[PDB]
Amino acid sequence: AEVISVHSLEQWTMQIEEANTAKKLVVIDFTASWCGPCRIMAPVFADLAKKFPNAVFLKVDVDELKPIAEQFSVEAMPTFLFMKEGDVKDRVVGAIKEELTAKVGLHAAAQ
């Protein structure tokens, strides 16, 4: 499984609606090109995506898709947002590898 980079509002909409129909967890990495911690977390996020194929892992550039960043009040980066069937389930803020890993494991399992 791969991290899906979302580069438009149309792409965002498609990914979210398809995930919601399939009733699967969505984990979004809110990132920026100039953000050092974000670069550090990129491989960690990609690794988790491979380990959890039942969940959808999305990457959103906050400068590219401002309405989506604004929607979730994302001003700190990286922010990892957990969402399932329209509801925010969790948030990880910063390059905290252990916390991200634990929360993916918690939310991706059968509920």
Walk me through the domains of the chain, giving residue ranges and CATH numbers: 3-111 (3.40.30.10)
Structure tokens at 29: 């990495």
CA dihedral 29, 34, 37, 42 (to 10 degrees): 50
- 38 Cβ contact partners less than 8 Å away, ≥ 6 residues apart: 29, 31, 32, 77, 78, 95
Name the residue among 52, 28, 54, 53 with its Cα closest to residue 41: 28
Find out whether 80 and 95 touch, Cβ atoms under 8 Å.
no
What is the layout of strands, in order, in the sheet containing 4-6? Answer: 4-6, 56-61, 26-31, 79-84, 87-93
Give the resolution in Å.
Answer: 1.7
Residues with a catalytic annotation lie at 35, 38
- Rounded Cα distance, 54 and 88, in Å: 18
Structure determined by: X-ray
Helices 97-108 & 36-51 angle (0-180, nearest 10): 30
In sequence order, which ranges of 52-96 are alpha helices (DSSP H)?
Answer: 66-71
Find out whether 57 and 3 touch, Cβ atoms under 8 Å.
yes
- 33 Cβ contact partners less than 8 Å away, ≥ 6 residues apart: 61, 63
